[PDB]
Structures are given as structure tokens and as C-alpha cells.
Symmetry: D2
Subunit: 334 residues, 4 copies
Amino acid sequence: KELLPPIAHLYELPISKEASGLVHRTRQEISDLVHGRDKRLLVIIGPCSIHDPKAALEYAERLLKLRKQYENELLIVMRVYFEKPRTTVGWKGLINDPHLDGTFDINFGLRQARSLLLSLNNMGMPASTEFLDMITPQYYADLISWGAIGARTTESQVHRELASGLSCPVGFKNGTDGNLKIAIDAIGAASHSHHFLSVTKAGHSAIVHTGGNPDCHVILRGGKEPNYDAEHVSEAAEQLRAAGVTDKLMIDCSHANSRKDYTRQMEVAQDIAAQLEQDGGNIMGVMVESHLVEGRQDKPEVYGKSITDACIGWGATEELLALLAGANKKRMAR
Amino acid sequence: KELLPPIAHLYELPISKEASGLVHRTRQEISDLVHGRDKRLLVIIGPCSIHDPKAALEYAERLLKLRKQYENELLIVMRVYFEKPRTTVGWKGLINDPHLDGTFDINFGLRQARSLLLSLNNMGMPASTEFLDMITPQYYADLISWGAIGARTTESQVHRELASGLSCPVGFKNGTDGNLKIAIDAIGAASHSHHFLSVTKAGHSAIVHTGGNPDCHVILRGGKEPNYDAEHVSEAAEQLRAAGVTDKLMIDCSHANSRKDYTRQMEVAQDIAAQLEQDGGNIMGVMVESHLVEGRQDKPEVYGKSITDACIGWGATEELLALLAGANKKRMAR
Amino acid sequence: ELLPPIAHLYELPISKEASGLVHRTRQEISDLVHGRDKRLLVIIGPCSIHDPKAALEYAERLLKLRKQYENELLIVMRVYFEKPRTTVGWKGLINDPHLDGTFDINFGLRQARSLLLSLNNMGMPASTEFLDMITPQYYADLISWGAIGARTTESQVHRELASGLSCPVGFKNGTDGNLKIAIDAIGAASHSHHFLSVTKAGHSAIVHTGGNPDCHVILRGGKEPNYDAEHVSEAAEQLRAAGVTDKLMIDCSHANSRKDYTRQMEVAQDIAAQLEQDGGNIMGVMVESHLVEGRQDKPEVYGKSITDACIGWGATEELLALLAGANKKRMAR
Amino acid sequence: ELLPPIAHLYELPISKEASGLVHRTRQEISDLVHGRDKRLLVIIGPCSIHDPKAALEYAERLLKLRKQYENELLIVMRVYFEKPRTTVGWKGLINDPHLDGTFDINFGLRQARSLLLSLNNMGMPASTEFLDMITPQYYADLISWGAIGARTTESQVHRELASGLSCPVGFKNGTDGNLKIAIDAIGAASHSHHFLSVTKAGHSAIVHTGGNPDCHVILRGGKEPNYDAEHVSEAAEQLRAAGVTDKLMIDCSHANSRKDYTRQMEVAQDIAAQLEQDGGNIMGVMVESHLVEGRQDKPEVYGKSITDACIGWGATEELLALLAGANKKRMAR
Ligand SMILES: C/C(=C\P(=O)(O)O)C(=O)O
Ligand SMILES: C/C(=C\P(=O)(O)O)C(=O)O
Ligand SMILES: C/C(=C\P(=O)(O)O)C(=O)O
Ligand SMILES: C/C(=C\P(=O)(O)O)C(=O)O
Ligand SMILES: [Mn+2]
Ligand SMILES: [Mn+2]
Ligand SMILES: [Mn+2]
Ligand SMILES: [Mn+2]
């Protein structure tokens, strides 16, 4: 079917001066955290997946007040995930199937994704996403301040290639059974120049030569056992230094680290707060799955409630952010 | 140099009637093995990587005689791997860097890949490869009788999507630390229809809708420990049946099953031969890394010797194939 | 970077109403071309579009007359986006929409399509000269009738283009008065051709056209004007000799008015007299008309041509009334 | 599907020798166009190429004379791949290379590029009429001189094309004899244009050309022939009035021979007499020549035109010897 090239969307939705400045400055600010120049905590927080732009904008408006309130302690960036990896089969996200009905209206999905990202940046909320697909990034990447390569794709050479040409900092996740070495290896790969095939803004395949991404880091997201605690952070930092890459890392509160209880995210955050208060020198960030309303649902019946992984709700989000701000204020003073 | 689209190569190197027939029949023959309709053993055998077409053709000519000799017991298909996944960085194969000098002459690489595959199929030798890149398959897939998705990419949704649209049977490998469930999950994914972005024969990005691949199976290739033995095969078969997919599987002699020691492939093959002789009902295939000359080398100084993973040499190859043919002859008679 | 036709089609898909109007107008014109209906096709409007707002106001006025005269006249607006220059100069709204030498062709194509969609949606079918080879994929679906210009009628690439258009096409006599090139052009464009063109996705491709069975000639003057009965009669003889339709269109403007917009009425009066006496070979006329008469070098005055001089709105009413009255009589015979 | 230019360029890259010949020939011709050298450019060869074998044999014979006469004549072969028809008919080797209505354009472009590369590699530069808008990207790098035809000289899209070509371009007078269209064409093509075209990758794009400073006119007859001293003198006055080069080319064939190949020699003799008397405004001639004289509808006889009738090889030797002798005298004055 009849795919519009990136230039069609760029024409309708050009990046504004304000969005461009926010992206540029947020990428910079994050690089500073990755390389230990600033001790604020990056907080990648928001829905597991975007399925409704209206709810995402309402969430963003609430989060913006806290982004501002905590700006001396936290760098808050919203989760705006358009692409979802499934264990076998399922809904792959807003771009692949925006109408949530198996119509796969990808032209509409890319348009809606770009539109939402532009609105978010224009209101002052920077955005993050997982880069899963090889061809979709040309459509919206200019609006992304931080990227994840997922646990299921961190070992993949084509994903490492992709990351090597992205202009935002990138977090590589440990593997789904807990293998951290694949993410450490991934920084090594993505930091170098690569030559590979990719698709241009005009929608044509081409040979690209990337310059390498100097702003990669790992993310601890659990495996067979969770890996959030001080012992695990310390072990990861040793391995990072041994490989000659940044020993500043991010901890995902959700997924394998919270296991089967989405409310465990608060426990993980409390453990992280305690680390920050004792020492926590190797922590530069955290990820939290948060929405307007807690939990999850198979069908999009309740407004502001995840249709993918379960999330904490708004009230818990306030507590979690206050907790982390208070703890990091102390780390920063020390 | 701009990227030539698939149609340029197809124009210069159209598939012949003979090649087309060999591919069609070999794919069918393999499907029969995958689904338990024939008890011959698929043997995916040849170099770790192709770096010299002249040596590959000489290898193929030798292997053809054994392909014919053993055709009632074994279905022999050559390893013709053009794309290599690296742990961090390194030579990614003949397509990416055909001159082996960091010039990345991908147009020449794709041409040379297609030319070699056409010559192989024309001489009567079917071909196999790992499908790693998303855009390169349109150049040569029509000449491939069996595909692998690698241990490092089996969990990747974009690779499962790719496999779902391939016209050849596909083997998914267990993960690098030994996780089999990701390959079982991968069959589940790739057997279904997907919608995703891909590039057309004219070199333009497009939305593709695949029909699913009914001929996927798993490959046991070792993890932290090898997984070739009867116990492991039996456990894998139970898990396959539980997931409702084919419980016929393939066993890689090389890689983590030989602990990266080419001299151990024969031991693995002997264990497999013993399984076939005792029962071995769930085995439909094996993989072997084999070349004209054993071992490996960093620079392509010695003719017919691998520059990637170490391989057994031609003499050991004869013993290994005779061993497997004799063992499977007995299984087939039972 | 040039956006492909599909980008514009996505933003501005043809509506059911526009699609029906185009389809039916093309049919109606085919009927005139082949002598099945005796209404007079009237291709009327600005020499060139340079301001969509004025074009929409003009269209709204013309629509009332299109409806009023529908039993005698088939009124279709001139919506010309591409202009052939003698040497160099402004080539039209698509090539340079901001009229300042910035050549914002993406904006120009968008604006052309948008205007054409709005016109068809309001009930006013559109005509244009097809000059460029690649631009038609952007808006052709919204055009009910096309012209191949005097300067391009003899060109094989223009005859190829016409052969694949889904609308009727008028070919003009050459700039010094040669009619045979337009007769030859019908011959060419009526047949199937294979040639290179660009797809809706913006890629070059081999196209195989089916031929255009609805082509006709247009008399637009040469060294001397050619609109009179004698000239029409001579043209019709030549058309029959070549085995093509002997129903033709007469341009009031250009070489036939000797570039004097005040003479278009005189030409129309001559045509009216032909229709009243006999005028069996006439199926249409062209008139260069705008809100305000004359022309100007710079787009200072609203609704006034920046290319060839046009008659104004008041003269347009008189001219259309004149032609409707004359053709009512022809049709009654 | 249509292969983009890059596919053909990959298989048939221009050689160093071909590249040098093209570069130097274009410069040599520019020198003639602007009156810096008094050699006579001779564009000579088949009306159309339909068989590459015969073209290469022709070229080998012509090369000897190219060399022999190099101090008096600059000989460039006619290698025409695109033909304008009066109505319908075979459009040339690119459009239908198998001459059977299969329209194998991919094969045609390949064969065109291959022949041009072989010709340049053997030392014979090439000329062609540029008719089609998309084909030139495939082979233009191998062309030393281009014609815009009589039927397309007035066409703005052809003037745009010429403005971006890297070779000198001759514009022909119109088919009824109008020279002003070609003079106007130089004015147009010498300026910068913006328009749509297709890239080497096969995608449509906006191009901005720099203008072509090496354009000139070609006298090719009209209703009457226009090759004589009086006509040359009158053309030169008009060229100076328009501020463009008053050095022109004279086509021996077409309407100057009244479509009679046996009259090309008479025209050449008239031109020779002009060169001997004065003939200061003449920089070139065109001649339709093949291995064997005449024409045929089907390609039955080897080396005989299937389009316009040509003189044969023997007559070609006489004609070249005549022009060399005459120009040797002009150059000595
Ligand atoms: C799938 C994912 C996280 P991971 O790649 O760690 O499983 C997510 O944020 O939804
Ligand atoms: C890298 C590879 C196999 P695996 O994907 O099991 O590591 C190979 O055949 O070279
Ligand atoms: C240039 C033109 C008409 P023609 O092609 O008869 O000169 C026009 O309608 O503006
Ligand atoms: C068609 C042509 C010349 P002209 O464009 O003067 O009619 C030719 O050389 O074949
Ligand atoms: Mn999640
Ligand atoms: Mn290997
Ligand atoms: Mn006009
Ligand atoms: Mn000719």
C-alpha cells in the first residue's frame, strides 16, 4: 500500500523554532547527565504506549507543572512510545495501527504521531520513545529528545546501526533474561561509525554513513531477577568501566524490575531514593510507567488507562516524583 | 555512489528456469521435513561467511557430489551467508564490505552476492543464508531455499516481520545465553500475517502486508551450556508441542554447541548420529560450519579458509556427512 | 525537495461531488465534440490565475450564468496555471506562486489543486492548458477540458500527454496560422502511445496510453484572424479529409482579437451571426475574461490580469447573453 | 518497470577517453558558435539510428574523413534516437528498439548508451535531437551537440531542457519557415529556468538550470527553402537585432531539399559557393547520410534509412570533399 514519504509529513508539520530549541537543549542536558557533568536525575515517565492523543496531551499538561517544579533536581521527559514489541503477536502501537481495529492505517499513524510530538514540544514537554522500526524514525525523530532501544532489540546489529545515526542520546536495555553485556556491547557498536541501508526523507532506499552516537548508556530493566538495587548498580558500573564506556546508568522501575505488580514501581523508586541519599553516584536516570489512571485494560474502554503494560496512576505519580526530587536534592548538595 | 534498486540487479541477473525450479522444489522438500512428512535430514553446511566467490564455487562443486550421493538420506544445502552480526564492531560480510578493506561498496556487494547465488543454483546447489538486514533481501531472496534468523535477532519484532513475508522456510535460533522460548515465540509471530514498512523492488519504501510463514522451526545452537543432547531435544520438543507449533527442530553443531571450537563439531554430530540411531524422531536437521580448509584467519591470506568463525575442513566434512547419512539411513528404515 | 502527487492527493482528495461533476462535464463535452449535442462549449475566464481569491469570486459570478444558460451553453472556467512565454517571463501560478521569482513549486501545486477542488465543489468545472509534462499528475483529475497551446500543438511529447488524458482536449492552430498541425495532433493523440512519464509516487515510469477519442481543433488566429465563416468552412473540409471530427472551437482572444481585448466581442458577434445563419461546425468558443478589464504588469489591482488583457465582468455578461441567444436559435432548427 | 539512469551508468560508465572527446568537442563547437574558429561544423549521418551494427560501420568510414578534413571541418555524427512523427509512426530506437511495436524502452536506453559509448571510444563524437524530457539523463553525457527540432523549437519545455544541457544546442526554424521562434528560443535557453525534471535515481525533482550560452539557429527550410545567401544574410541581420550570435547552421536535408535526398548536394554546392565568396555567418551544415541511399518502410536492406531518405556513402565522400575544399579557401582569407 501507498506510503507517503517523510517529506509529505514534514511539509504539513514543520518543526517550530520553539520545538527545535527544546529538543536541542534537552538532548544537551541529557548528554550532560550521561557524561557526569550534571547530577540532576533524568526521569523518563509516562504511558507504556500512546493510544489516544487527547489523553496524552492531558497527561503532558499535568506533568509539565511537575517538570517545572522539580527542574533543579529532575529532568522530566515524557514517555511517548509509538512502537511496541510483542512477545508473539498483538497491537504494535499507534503508528502501526492507529485506529486500534486492525486496519493498519500507517499513513494516518505517522501523521498523528508527528502531530502529537509537535504539540508536546510546543507546550514545553520534551518526548522520548523506543525506536523499534527501521523506516519510521525519519518521520518524527527530529522531535525526540531521548530514545530507547528495547530489551528485545539491544543485541540486534540493525538497531545498533540505527542508534549510531540518531541525534538524540540513546539508552540500551539489558536483555529480557538479565544479560547486561549486550547493552554494554551495544554502546560500543553504536558509538562507532557504520555504513548500512536506510531510507531517505524522500522515501527512497540509500546507503547511509553514520558518525556514531557519543551519548549512549545502559538501562537496568530486570531479568530473571530484578536488577535495580545498589549491588546490581555497583556490578554494572564495574562492567561499564571495564569496557571503557560511561558508568552512568538508568534504572527502569517498571517491567522486569516491578514484575507482576505495577505498584511495585514505588518500592523500586524508594530503593533508588535510598541509593541517592546514601551515595548513588552511578545513577543518572529512572523510567516509570505512569498514566492518568492506574492499571491496564485489553480494550480502550476507560480514558487515560493503558492498553499495554499496567501503569501507576496520577496520584502515585506525584508521590513518586516528590520522593525522587527530595532524594536527589540531597545527592546534589553533597 | 547512489544505491541501485533491486530491479537493476534483477535486470542484469534474472533467475533462470533451472534455478527457479531448484529453489521451488528445495523449499517444498524442506517444508516436508519441517512438518514431519519426510524423514531425511536437512543439512545446512558450508562457510561461516562468504568472502571469496571463487572458493565458494569450488566448495559447492565438491559438496554437490555428496548432495547427490546422500540424497535418499540427507538434503544438503550450502551455507552462503552474506550478512554477519558482530559482538560490537567488525566486518559485516560480503554485501556490506565486499572488498574487505573498509570501502563499503554495497552496490558491488549486492551484485556479487546475487551473481554467486545464481551460479550456485544453476549448478544444482541450493543456498541458505542468515537474513540480518531489512532492505537487502529484495536483491537475492528469490535465490534462497532456507533462511536463518540469528540468535541475536530472533527476539526482534522486525526480524519476525521479515520472516513472515519470506517464501522460504526459516529457522529461528535460541538466544545467545540459551533461551529457547524466544525462538518458539518467533514461530508464533512469523506464522501470522503482519503489516509493516519495507522497500519495493524499485527502491521505494512501502507498506507491506505479509501472509505469514507456515514453515518456521527452531534451531538449537547452544547457550551458556550446549543444548544438542537428547535431554535438551526432548525438553525443546515438549515446549514446542505446548505452544502448538512444529516439534521438529534443527541442531547447530557449531557456535555455542561446539563452544566456538571447530574441532568439537564432529563430537556434536556423533551425538546426533547416536540419537538418530536410537530414536531421534524430533530432529529434522543439522548445521555445520565447513570450508575447503579448516580453522580461521584474520586476513584473507589462505584460499578457502574462513575469516569469521573457524570451520572444519574438507576431509572432516566427508567423514561428518558419511556419519550422518549412515545414521539417518537406519532411522528412515525403522 | 519536490513532494510527489500522492502527498497532495492525501491532503486534498477528490470529493464525490467534484468527481461526479468532472465525469459528467467530460461526457457532456465529448457529446459536443462528436456532434451529439448542439450546445456551445464556452471556455471562459482569466488568461492566467494569479490570485485564488479573485478566481473564486469570479467563479461564483460565472456559476449563476452557467446555470442560467445551461440549455444553450456549457460554461467551463479558464483556470490556467501554466503560461508559455515568447522568450522569458512569469510561467504561472504553479511555477512561481508568490510572483516574486522564488519558484515555490510545492506551494504552487498545492494551491492549484486546492483552487480546483474548491471550484468543482461549488459546481464550476475547470479547464487549463497542459504545458508541463510532470505537473498534470497533481491536478488532472479535477480538469474537465484541456488545451494544448499553439506553441506546443506540433510537439510530440504534448500529443503523447494528450493521448493519456481522461478529458477532451483542444489543439490550437500554430502561431502563424497553420491548422494542419492541430489536425495532425488529433491523429496522433487519438492513438495509443508508449512513453516515459512520472507516477503518482514521483517515480519515472513507462506509460502506455489508450488514445484520446475526444480531441478537436481550436482556431486562434495566425498572421490573420481565422474565426469567420470562410475559415470555419475551410477548416471543416480539412478535418473531414483527415477523417477526424469536423466540429471545432473558436478562440475569441489572442491572434483572433489581435491582442485587443475590446475585439473579443466583435469576434463573438461574428460567431453569433454564424450560429444564426448555420454554424453547424462550431462546438465551442474561448474568451479571456476577468472581474476587471485590461491588464497590468504588477498585481496591484484586484481581479485584473497580469498576463493577456481580458474583458471585464460587464462585457462578459453581454457576451454570454449574445451567444446564448444565438445558439438557442441554432438548436431550435 | 523503468530502470533509472544510475543502473545504466553503473553498467556503462563514461570512459576517460569518451569524457575527453565530449569535453573537447563541446568546446570546439562553442568556438564556432561564437566566431572564434572558422572551421565548419558538419553534423552528418543517418536520419535515425535503427541498427547499431550499421551505425558503427558508418562511423568507422566517417572517422577517416573526420581526420582527413580536421583542419577545415569538424565532423560529428548524427546519432538520432528520438523521432518526431507527423501523426503516428516509429519514434526511434529508444521508444521501440526491436522495431516491432514491443516498446522495450529499458533495452532501447541501454542500447542507445552502449552505442554512444562505443562511438566516443572509437573517436567519433555524437549528436542527437533531444525530443523527450526524461530520456536525456540516460545518455546526455555522451552527446557533443544537440538539436531541438523544428516542431519543438517554440515549446517552452524544450527551451527549458536546452537551458540545462551541457552541450551546444541548435534550434531549428519552424516547419513553415518561421525563424523568429528559434531566435526567441536562444533568448529563452540562454537564461536560467526552474522546472520539474527527473533525477539520475529516477525521481521527479525541481531543477534550477544555469542557462546555455552556446545556442544557435539552424536554417532547415519552410514552405520554401532558406539556405541561400539572401536568406542567410536576412537571418544574420535578425540575429544581431536580437543580440544573439549571428553564426548559424544550414540543414541540407528536410525542407531545404524539399524532402528529396538527391537535392542535398545542390544545397551543399550553394553553401560551398557562399563559403568561397564570403559566407562569414555560416558555422555549420547538417546532412542526412547513410551507407546506402534512399529509404524503406521495413528494415530489409542493411544501412538504408527507415525514416527520411539519405544520401549514400559515395555521395557523402563527394559532399565532404566539396565542403572541405570550399572552407579551406574561406579560412585562408
Ligand atoms: C517493552 C518495553 C520495555 P523492555 O524493552 O524493557 O521490555 C516498554 O517500555 O514497553
Ligand atoms: C553468528 C552465526 C550463528 P548464531 O546466530 O547462532 O550466533 C553464524 O552462523 O555465523
Ligand atoms: C498563450 C495562450 C493561448 P495560445 O496557445 O493560442 O497562444 C493563452 O490562453 O494564454
Ligand atoms: C526531424 C528532423 C529535422 P526537423 O526537426 O528540421 O524537421 C530530423 O533530422 O530527422
Ligand atoms: Mn511497558
Ligand atoms: Mn558462524
Ligand atoms: Mn492568454
Ligand atoms: Mn530526417
